[PDB]
Design a protein around this ligand. Structure first.
Ligand SMILES: COC[C@H]1CC[C@@H]2/C1=C\[C@]1(C)C(=C(C(C)C)[C@@H]3CCO[C@@H]31)[C@@H](O[C@H]1O[C@@H]3COC(C)(C)O[C@H]3[C@H](O)[C@H]1O)[C@H](O)[C@@H]2C
Ligand SMILES: COC[C@H]1CC[C@@H]2/C1=C\[C@]1(C)C(=C(C(C)C)[C@@H]3CCO[C@@H]31)[C@@H](O[C@H]1O[C@@H]3COC(C)(C)O[C@H]3[C@H](O)[C@H]1O)[C@H](O)[C@@H]2C
Ligand SMILES: [Ca+2]
Ligand SMILES: [Ca+2]
Ligand SMILES: [Ca+2]
Ligand SMILES: [Ca+2]
Ligand SMILES: [Cl-]
Ligand SMILES: [Cl-]
Ligand SMILES: [Cl-]
Ligand SMILES: [Cl-]
Ligand SMILES: [Mg+2]
Ligand SMILES: [Mg+2]
Ligand SMILES: [Mg+2]
Ligand SMILES: [Mg+2]
Lengths: 236, 6, 236, 6
């Protein structure tokens, strides 16, 4: 593509530099170029790909929420007619966010998921698939909203099924997947009970397997376990 | 305040 | 331009929304569209224009410094040969930063400065002219560096001459101009003595005029006076 | 740490 003439290793080196410079749009474009080289990603490279886009879409989502909240206030009784600008600009931000999601989903479908045979790669990509459909669902308001939602559910559920069969209950990818699937239940699928049960059960099964870990793996798992606990505290 | 995701 | 079909007032409304959403690239593009309508800017609109670009270039400058520091470390004795990537990516960021500066300087030259007759508009634009030449000087390493430097000096000096004749010593624009011209002396023109004298004298003349101000104007002036004091503390 | 500008 745009990154067609750059060496794969140079793209990776540059993605790491853009991360250090907090240049996440650049980071993401370098990683998209690396994926498009056609070779599978290593563990480190999957982590770079995920960080790049999560940061980019995370800035777009925060912006969309600011603008959506302004837009709703302007639609309240007694608010003065501001004209079309707030809706137009929210739509602009929304469209760009949707294009980022479509780009990630594109990479996963062409051809990351189909070549991912190990549990750690396959679950990682399926979690990303559920995440980007979930970001689409956050902004969806039309006839496709139910289908977007259930594409998020189906990707998360396939990732859960594999992670349960193939990964220990403390694996960070298993834990991060459950945390996000649990947020999907709470916030997207209007199933706060399912959200809470999943976060509880995931946390308790991780607790009971901590004993098997080195001190460095202990540190990695308890970090995400803490985020499960934060949501349980907020939700109960 | 805002729920956590990762 | 790109914003040729949007109403001036809508561009301004959208710039304010992009500020709230912290979308400074968008904010800057809307303000560039508003300037290109050909009408003079009000006080509020000048402030929006300045905030938009200062944020955009400020992110590019921070990134450039991260990358420049990496690049210098790789050029130190005993550092392993990393190849051309760090230089290439620093150059990429540098080129984009230079294009932002050239765009602002373009707006000021076509045709903001020439139509700015009141001191508050004219000094404000000249300060911006010195700032964007100063950002160019930060990255300049070739045969044009001396000319870039003295374009920054000349713009700041014309702004100082007008502000001294036409503005009170506590005016925020006068104070912000002196603060930045003083940084230019310290950091760009290798004149830390001139930098210190200017910050001292500016601070002391503002102190002696505080008595003339309302409580709200007092608050605005002392805020920038504090930044002059911070630099004097750092530099002495 | 870093000098101030505005
Ligand atoms: C597709 O979903 C990806 C999520 C699921 C949970 C988390 C994943 C994200 C990353 C890559 C990692 C985690 C943390 C928990 C380490 C961060 C949390 C969000 O982004 C990163 C993965 O961690 C990896 O990457 C980190 C990069 O940043 C540093 C901090 C340098 O440290 C690195 C860790 O040492 C490394 O193990 C963590 O194993 C899993 C994969
Ligand atoms: C070309 O150089 C512009 C600088 C020179 C010093 C400072 C200018 C910047 C802005 C617009 C303003 C100041 C502060 C000191 C108020 C900020 C500091 C950097 O950016 C803004 C100008 O302040 C104005 O804009 C602010 C926007 O943000 C709020 C906070 C809402 O409050 C607004 C103030 O009430 C308004 O007076 C301040 O008067 C002068 C013009
Ligand atoms: Ca296993
Ligand atoms: Ca960790
Ligand atoms: Ca005057
Ligand atoms: Ca103020
Ligand atoms: Cl728009
Ligand atoms: Cl609680
Ligand atoms: Cl590059
Ligand atoms: Cl000191
Ligand atoms: Mg090759
Ligand atoms: Mg394979
Ligand atoms: Mg018109
Ligand atoms: Mg005029």
């Amino acid at each position: 593509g745009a990154m067609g003439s750059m060496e794969r290793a140079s793209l990776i080196q540059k993605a790491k530099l853009a991360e250090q410079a907090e240049r996440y749009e650049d980071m993401a474009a370098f990683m998209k170029g690396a994926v498009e080289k056609g070779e599978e990603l290593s563990n480190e490279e999957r982590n770079l790909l995920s960080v790049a886009y999560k940061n980019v879409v995370g800035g777009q989502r925060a912006a969309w929420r600011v603008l959506s909240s302004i837009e709703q206030k302007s639609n309240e009784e007694g608010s003065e007619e501001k004209g079309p600008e707030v809706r137009e600009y929210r739509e602009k931000v929304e469209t760009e966010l949707q294009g980022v999601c479509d780009t990630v989903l594109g990479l996963l479908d062409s051809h990351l998921i189909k070549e991912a045979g190990d549990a750690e790669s396959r679950v990682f990509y399926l979690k990303m698939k559920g995440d980007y459909y979930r970001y689409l669902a956050e902004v969806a308001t039309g006839d496709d909203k139910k289908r977007i939602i259930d594409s998020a559910r189906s990707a998360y559920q396939e990732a859960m099924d594999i992670s349960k069969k193939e990964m220990p209950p403390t694996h960070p990818i298993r834990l991060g997947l459950a945390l996000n699937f649990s947020v999907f239940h709470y916030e997207i699928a209007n199933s706060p009970e399912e959200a809470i049960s999943l976060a509880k059960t995931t946390f308790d099964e991780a607790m009971a397997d901590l004993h098997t870990l080195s001190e460095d793996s202990y540190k990695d798992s308890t970090l995400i376990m803490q985020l499960l606990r934060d949501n349980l505290t907020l939700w109960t | 305040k805002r729920r956590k995701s990762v």
